[PDB]
Amino acid sequence: DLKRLRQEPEVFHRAIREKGVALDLEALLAVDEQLHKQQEVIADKQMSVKEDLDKVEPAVIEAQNAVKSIKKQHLVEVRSMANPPAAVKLALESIALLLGESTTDWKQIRSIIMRENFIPTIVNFSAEEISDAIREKMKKNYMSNPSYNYEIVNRASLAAGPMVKWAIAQLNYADMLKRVEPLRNELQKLEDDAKDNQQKLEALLLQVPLPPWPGAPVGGEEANREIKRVGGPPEFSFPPLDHVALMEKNGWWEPRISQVSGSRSYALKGDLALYELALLRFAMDFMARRGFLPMTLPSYAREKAFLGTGHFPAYRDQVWAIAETDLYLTGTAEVVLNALHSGEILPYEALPLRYAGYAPAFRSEAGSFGKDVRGLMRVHQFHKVEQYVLTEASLEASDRAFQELLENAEEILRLLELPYRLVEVATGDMGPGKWRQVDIEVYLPSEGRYRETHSCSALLDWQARRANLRYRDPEGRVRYAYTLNNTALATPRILAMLLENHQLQDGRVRVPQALIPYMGKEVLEPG
């Protein structure tokens, strides 16, 4: 918000430092000021060109109607002459010259006058299409002749009089075009400087961070801090396998996929494949019982919807584009969900919107080299159910929906019988649009640590302003809404945690009580 950025210089400097955003806020505002000055100059100069061309247009329209109104009997007593009066012959020659005729034969040119297409070509005629050669030939041969004149020619023919009128108006228009050209070329550069400034500004603006909540740790990722843990590291009395080894022992995965599809791919087999789909539906039912509206969505969107969530331009490199298309595969259903209502004024009574959106998800994982190289932790395409909340503009509403979103993910993990913890994310690790982020993490025995499975975020109105999400308040004004989101459940990474936490001594794997109705059994069969 420009005006808000000025009246508040400190708040935004602090926000920018806190988030580790390199944003020069004065250079931004100086782009805005410079643009504004460029636009006013462009407008004065456009006016100057417009005045010039407005000078010569009426004579063209007057002559054009005069030629059209020449009677037929008059076109005939010009076509009749073998032997034209000199001032009359001058007139026709100039018309033939201008029309691009390639013959100065009088007989030949006295003819086009009664062409079915003559007037039609005269009307359609454009003075911008006159060459400088014809232009200079017109001044040398004809303007410079004392008889080449409406007054003088019109006395001799009321057919040639109009035509000399028309030819002169065109020449004058043509000479005005010529005059106006250097201002027009200039205006062209200014106009392009200005467009370039508008894109330079719009892209600074899209970097402005939300001020973070006062309770968030201040620093980079190393300032993230655990606030809670529920359950613990399992203890096995046998020597536990990691998830890859479990899937091998049991025939639950298809390693051959990396030859078909490249690295960071996975393909599940037998009871584990069925388990993945059981998990997505369990999570959708769960979210539906919770009063969130179930949705199934495409995994692609246009640029505008990545712009509105903040995925573009900041995290552009995490996104796969679809070539020879304007479409990009989405990493999360939040991009589609956030975009559904752009441009609408929601009635306050609809508030809040609570969506549980399922979509396949795609990530380039560019820049993940050496991270999670094996198994189910980090893959290119995977399946997620997302919680998305749109809310009226209060901290109270937003604090409330953030609590619910977090309890939902926790209750899901309790039902999955997995040990987890909550982590408060630092201002420098939160991302630019965030008020608060809390990550939920599940204990993964093979790495001896917790690994994220959920990220819960409140944004306030920072997505709302970018995606133009607005609502009407009880008072009758339109305001931008607040938004939040959190994962409900994503596979196959949660499968890593489930395999390792619920592995039994004989290498088989238990199903948690809440998943038994979905699976038809209490133990995954060693296919």
Ligand X SMILES: Nc1ncnc2c1ncn2[C@@H]1O[C@H](COP(=O)(O)O)[C@@H](O)[C@H]1O
CA distance 60 to 343: 45
Name the residue nearer to ligand X (CB basis): 250 or 487. 487
Rule CB under 6 A: choose which of 110, 341, 436, 454 binds ligand X: 454
- Smallest distance, Å, CB 363 to ligand X? 4
If binding is defined by CB under 8 A, does position 156 make contact with a copy of itself?
A: no
CB 463 within 8 A of CB 308: yes
Torsion over CA: 413, 417, 423, 429 (sign): negative
Output 86 or 373, the one with its CB closest to a copy of itself.
373
Q: Does 257 help bind a copy of itself (rule: CB under 8 A)?
A: yes
Reading the block at residue 236, the tokens are 């096995």
Per the listing, tokens 């969130």 go with 292
| Contact stretch for a copy of itself (CB under 8 A) within 115-123, 199-207, 230-238, 302-310 | 302-310
Eight-state DSSP code of residue 81? -
Distance CA 191, CA 45 (A): 11
Q: Please name the helix (run of DSSP H) or strand (run of DSSP E) that holds residue 356, with its range, or none.
A: strand 353-362
Using CB under 6 A, pick the residue from 142, 252, 382, 482 that binds ligand X. Answer: 382
Q: Is 452 a catalytic residue?
A: yes
Note if 455 is an active site residue: yes
What span, in angstroms and rounded, lies between the C-alpha atoms of 360 and 425? 26
> Quick one: what does residue 297 bind among ligand X, a copy of itself, none, with the CB cut-off 5 to 8 Å set by partner type?
a copy of itself
- Choose, by CB under 6 A, the member of 159, 247, 351, 490 that binds ligand X: 490
Smallest gap, in angstroms, from Cβ of residue 301 to a copy of itself?
Answer: 5
Given 404, 455, 470, 500, the catalytic residue: 455
Least Å distance, CB 298 to a copy of itself, is 5
SS3 state of residue 8: coil
CB 405 within 8 A of CB 412: no
Q: Is 227 in the site for a copy of itself (CB under 8 A)?
A: no
268 touches a copy of itself by CB under 8 A: yes
CA distance 317 to 34: 31
Q: Is 509 annotated as a binding residue?
A: no
CB neighbours of 102 closer than 8 A, spacing ≥ 6?
A: none
Residue 94 vs 332, nearer CB to ligand X: 332
- Give the three-class secondary structure for 279: helix
Per CB under 6 A, which region of 7-15, 196-204, 297-305, 447-455 contacts ligand X? 447-455
Least distance in Å: CB of 459 to ligand X?
13
B/e letters for 279-310, b = 16+ CB within 10 Å, e = fewer, are: bbebbbebbeebebeebebebbbebebbbbbb
Residue 378 catalytic? yes
Pick the binder of a copy of itself from 27, 123, 293, 478 (CB under 8 A).
293
Which is the catalytic residue, given 135, 264, 363, 470?
Answer: 363
The pairs formed by 285-290 with CB atoms below 8 angstroms and a separation of 24 or more are 286/408, 286/411, 286/412, 286/415, 286/488, 286/489, 287/356, 287/385, 287/387, 287/408, 287/488, 288/356, 290/356, 290/404, 290/408
Residue 380 binding a copy of itself, by CB under 8 A: yes
**Which residue, 365 or 404, is less far from ligand X as judged by CB?**
365
For residue 364, give both structure tokens: 């380039």
User: Residue 300 is encoded by which pair of tokens?
Assistant: 């692609």
Q: Which of 95, 210, 379, 460 binds ligand X (CB under 6 A)?
A: 379
Binding segment toward a copy of itself, per CB under 8 A, in 91-99, 241-249, 265-273, 399-407: 265-273
Q: Is 434 in the site for ligand X (CB under 6 A)?
A: no
Buried b / exposed e across 81-104, counting CB within 10 Å, b at 16+?
eeebbebbbbbbbbbbbbbebeee
What secondary structure does DSSP assign to 156-181, as a single string? H-TTHHHHHHHHHHHHHHHHHHHHHH
Asked whether 149 and 163 are in contact (CB, 8 A), the reply is no
Interacting residue with a copy of itself among 326, 452, 473, 506 (CB under 8 A): 326
| Residue 363 in marked binding region | yes
Amino acid (1-letter code) at residue 18: E
Does 202 show up as a binding residue in the annotation? no
Q: What's the CA gap between 473 and 497, in Å, rounded?
A: 44
DSSP output for 26-41: HHHHHHHHHHHHHHHH
Nearer to ligand X, 40 or 452 (CB): 452
Q: Which is nearer to ligand X, 67 or 379 (CB)?
A: 379
Q: DSSP readout, 299-338?
A: SEEEHHHHHHHT-TTTTGGG--EETTTTEEE-SSTHHHHH
Is residue 267 at the binding interface for a copy of itself, with CB under 8 A as the rule? yes
Is 453 labelled a binding residue? yes
Of the candidate spans 12-20, 37-45, 163-171, 376-384, the one that interacts with ligand X by CB under 6 A turns out to be: 376-384
- 365: partner contacted, choices ligand X, a copy of itself, none (Cβ within 5-8 A by kind): ligand X
If one asks whether residue 340 binds a copy of itself (CB under 8 A), the answer comes out as yes
> Is 510 one of the annotated active-site residues of the chain?
no
Is 493 a binder of ligand X (CB under 6 A)? Answer: yes
Return binding residues for L-serine: 332-334, 386, 487
Return binding residues for ATP: 363-365, 379, 452-455
Catalytic residues, by residue number, are: 363, 378, 452, 455, 493
Which positions lie near a copy of itself, rule CB under 8 A? 254, 256-257, 259-262, 265-271, 273-274, 276-278, 280-281, 284-285, 288, 293-302, 304-305, 320-327, 329, 336, 339-343, 358, 360, 380-381, 527
Which positions lie near ligand X, rule CB under 6 A? 332, 363, 365, 378-379, 382, 384, 452-455, 487, 490, 493
